Amino acid sequence: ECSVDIQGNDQMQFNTNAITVDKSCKQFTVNLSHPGNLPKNVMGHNWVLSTAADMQGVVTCGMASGLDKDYLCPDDSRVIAHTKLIGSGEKDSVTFDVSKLKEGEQYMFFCTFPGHSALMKGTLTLK
Numbered sequence: 001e002c003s004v005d006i007q008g009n010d011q012m013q014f015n016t017n018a019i020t021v022d023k024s025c026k027q028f029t030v031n032l033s034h035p036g037n038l039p040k041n042v043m044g045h046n047w048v049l050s051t052a053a054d055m056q057g058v059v060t061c062g063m064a065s066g067l068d069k070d071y072l073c074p075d076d077s078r079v080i081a082h083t084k085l086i087g088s089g090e091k092d093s094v095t096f097d098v099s100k101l102k103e104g105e106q107y108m109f110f111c112t113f114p115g116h117s118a119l120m121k122g123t124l125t126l127k
């Protein structure tokens with residue numbers, strides 16, 4: 001409806017590649033969980049949303065910020081929404097206002113844990 005449940009596993013994979021946000025939604029929520037066995041310092045996953053153009057810079061800034069900031073730069077204006085960084089058996093939800101999205105743009109979601117973004121990314125589109 002106006003939410004999606006996403007799992008990030010021990011093989012650096014999200015279980016979706018593409019999220020659609022319905023125009024009727026005023027908020028949208030992502031419920032993130034982490035099946036598998038590995039703790040967050042070795043296989044952490046977050047779900048972070050930006051424009052496609054901003055993805056790399058978000059990722060690089062996160063790398064500079066490190067594990068103790070959950071691999072995101074504090075106050076990064078390019079981050080539309082984000083969960084916290086989670087490890088196995090943990091969960092986190094993020095809810096954001098759909099007014100923050102422009103219609104028909106293919107934003108990207110991804111994990112900013114070192115090395116996860118090229119495998120752990122997808123599109124989000126407001127339709």
Ligand SMILES: [Zn+2]
Pocket residue numbers: 008043044045046111112113116120
């Ligand atoms: Zn990850």
